Every structure is written in C-alpha cells, then in structure tokens.
Amino acid sequence: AQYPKSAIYEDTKENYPLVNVEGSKVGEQYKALNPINGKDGRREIAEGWLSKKITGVNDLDKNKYKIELTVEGKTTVETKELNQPLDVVVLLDNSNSMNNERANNSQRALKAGEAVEKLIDKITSNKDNRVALVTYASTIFDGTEATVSKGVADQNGKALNDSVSWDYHKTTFTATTHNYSYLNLTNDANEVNILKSRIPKEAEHINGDRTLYQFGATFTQKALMKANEILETQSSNARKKLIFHVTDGVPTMSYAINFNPYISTSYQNQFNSFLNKIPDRSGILQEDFIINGDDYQIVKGDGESFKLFSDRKVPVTGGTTQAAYRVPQNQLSVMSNEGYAINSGYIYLYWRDYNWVYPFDPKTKKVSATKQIKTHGEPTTLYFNGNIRPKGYDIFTVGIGVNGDPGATPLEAEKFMQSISSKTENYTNVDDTNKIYDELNKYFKTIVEEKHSIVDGNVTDPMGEMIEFQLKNGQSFTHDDYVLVGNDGSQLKNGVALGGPNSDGGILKDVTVTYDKTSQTIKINHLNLGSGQKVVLTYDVRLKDNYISNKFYNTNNRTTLSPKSEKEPNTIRDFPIPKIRDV
C-alpha cells in the first residue's frame, strides 16, 4: 500500500512522475499508476509528442485495463543552401486602395494580411529564422507621428486645400499612425506574436478616419529603404536575407534626386555623374537623394499620380480646361488679405511644386532644359539599383491586381515591379486575392524545403512480464483487438486505412499494426506524421495470474519510437510506461 513516486526514461535517464489512476479505486487505495499528468500525459521530444496511458479501467476486480498510445509529429523548414538561418523582412502595402470594399469587395487588406500571417508562421516554424515587418503607405505605419503635404496652389504657388471637407488652410496633415510595423528582426516567440498582432487587416475608408486617409498613398521607396536599413544594421553574412513585398500599386511618392541648381553644368551631366559613381552605372547612391529632412518638406508626390506633371495647371475632372476654386463669400476678404491670386471670386488651381516635373529653377521656376524626372518609378528604381541590388538580398514581390493606376500603363507597372525584385521572375501579379498566399509560398519554397519529423516511423510496444495482451478469442490476434485512429478522422478498418479529407485513409495510408505472439509485442509501422498530425492506438491488457501481491508491475517492456526507421535507424525515443498491481 505504498506507491513509487516516479520512474525513468531509458534514453535520457531523466525522471517522469507517476500519478494515480482515479477509476482504479479500492476504498482509499489505488491499483494503477499513469505517467506525467492525469490529463493528456504528453512527452515532448524533438520529433513531436508521445504518450502512453491507461484511459480506461475495463473491469477493476479482474485487472482489465485499456492502454492508449499516441504520437504527434512536427514540421520545419530547412533552407536548401546549407542549413543557413534566414532573416526576413515583410513589406506590406496598406494604402487606401487596399481597403476591403475596393475592387468589388475583393478583400485586399484582409487577404494580404492573412497571407503574411501564414508566411510569418511557416518562416518561424524554424526557431532560428527571424522576421520583421514594415507596413507602409504615405509613410511607415509604425505608431509614431507623421506629416504629409496636400492641396493645390494659386499661380504664385500659394498653397490651399480646395476640398469642401477641409478648411483651405489644411495643406499639411499630422496624425499618429497605426502601429502596423515590427522593426527589429526577432525570433522570440512572444515578440513574433506581437508582430503578428500588428499586421493590418484593413485600410482607411474615405469617410472613416479622414485624417489618416490622407496618409494612404504609396511611398514604395521609403519602405524599400526601411527593409534595407533593418538588414544592414541587424543582420550579418552569417544569415541569408530575404524580403517579401506585397503591394497593390506603383509608387505615387518618392525621394528627390539631389540635383544642384547652383553648380554650372547641365542637369543631364549632374545625372550622368550620379550614375558614374556606381560600378554598373545603373543607379544613384543614397548620398545623392534628398533624405535628411522631414518627409512633408522634401518628398515628391502626394498620392496623386505615378507621373509628375509637365503642365502645372490642374485640369477639370475628365476635361481639358483649368480647374478653379469658388471662394466662399465669407472668406473672400481673408484670402485676399493673405495674398491669394483671386480672379473675380475664383482661384485658378496649380499643382504644388512637389508634383511638378523636376528639376526646375528655384528662382525662375523654369523647368530643366535637359534631364527631367517625370515619374516616381524612375527615382525609386535608381535608389534600388544604387543601394539595394548590390547587397544580394533575395527579393520577392507579389502584386495584387497591379495595373498602373494612377498614371502608369500596365506595362510600365510590370516593369517597375520587376525592377524592384531580385530577378524578373521574382515578381508575380495575381488576378485574385486567394492566390496571394500561394504566390508567397512558391517563392519561399525556392529557398526552403518542408520536412516532416516522422518519416516511415515505427512504434514498438512489448508487453511487460506480468502482462497479457487481450485477444478477443484468446488465441489469434485480429484487427478487432486494437483501434488505430488519426486526428484527421481516418481509421484502420480491417487493416486498411479509410477516411480523412480525400477518402484515401489520410494520415494512416499504408500504416499497419502487427503483432508478434511470442514476445507479445504490438507494433505500428510506416508512420508519416507532419505538423498537427496525431495517431492514437488503443488496445486491452490483463495482469497475469502469477503476480506478487501489492507489487506494482510495469504494463510494457521498453516502448519506443523510431521517427525515421530508414533515415536514422539508431534514433530511438522512449515512451512513458504505466504500472498496475492487485491482491
């Protein structure tokens, strides 16, 4: 009437506690003992989990118990080139166009966001890999205060907001952005969950938060820059470096090329000079962009177009003539005094200079007589070639119904997106937002291989010395004498797997359960178990007649798993073993 508190694994020598089996009660004394906990009873091993426990007392007086045995496996990704850890930065477009309503409720932001979450999970299925996330639009959505410039101007470039929803003075906006970024590379399980909680699932509505709606354009350059900065300062050559970029549009903002109006050469020469600093002459160094300022003061574009404007006059919507702003009567006096160029109640509207074709002379406003930057793709591609291509990062780009709106042709747009990927084949434009994840997964598969932890594995379960395996007829082992089921709802029926999603036997296809009458050993053969694939074996046992009183007997001899019985026959994991006794 005394109990052993615990026993010992034969593969690692570490202890496992033995609890009491409740249903085995003979008034305040216990007849059987289970290992680990009184619940699921799992033992974690490098290939997954395994348990072996009495789940049922069949007949207490006669010592008849029901053993349950379970095996659950794992998956990882190992990187094809030389088990090298990855450092991965996801770039996610969260522009207004990504709103779930848009493109006939195509659910861009939701679907993209979920693709990213899935990819982040797969990536981090390898404890070693690291992830970081940058969500962007007019700026990086990282939970800090940001400013953007908006509006139009009169003929002397005095700025006004011409929208009837805003005061005319509202020509910059300032807001705290949503925190949709995680800007340190991390592999910490908790930090990764935080990172996942920051992946946007929606974008702004024009009549939702109208302020943040002003920050919903596409500044692809700032994002690319941020991915580069994270890798450059946080990664190493120890690690392989990947960038996945999910986007729904061509850039509509960009950093300016730092043309210099005060030196005496053609802007085309200044340009050729920027390029000549680079081995391949394909790009412009960071030092030659205007970066060191506040975005609203220095950037080009405001979300309006991929194009910068030759004609500085705002045209009428679907028309040719110059748009004009009817001044409200109660504001005529004030705008006049302020200095606006008012022509009999109306202000004629020009694009603000940040949207003009450039360079142009700061004094005379005259456009360059030579080189002209006419799009936001050009400078973005130049920055990319100049500062990112060199580093050799693998760069995949999944576009979502990219077509060039606003201001690019579909062809112009495909070229741009190719130009900001590692190879031409590293950009794919999907026509349907359910393919977003397939596409991200193809590319990732390029770099990694999925490996299930249990490949042709074997369980060996010999009965303990005082134990009788129960046979329904006392003589022959039959398929009626054990039950094997998989957590995908498949089962061995008469030694043939049936069930699971494809009516093919699932998880249990070609698995077999065999028995050796002599050694009294039950075996599971041919297990192939990935992540969250689990198999459960139940059978019946009886304690043999020749037993010694109040002495706990083991239910099995050494019970083991061989996770890969071909790939590493020597890898052998122990199962915990219950114990029983009677008088």
Ligand SMILES: [Li+]
């Ligand atoms: Li039988």
Ligand SMILES: [Mg+2]
């Ligand atoms: Mg967009």
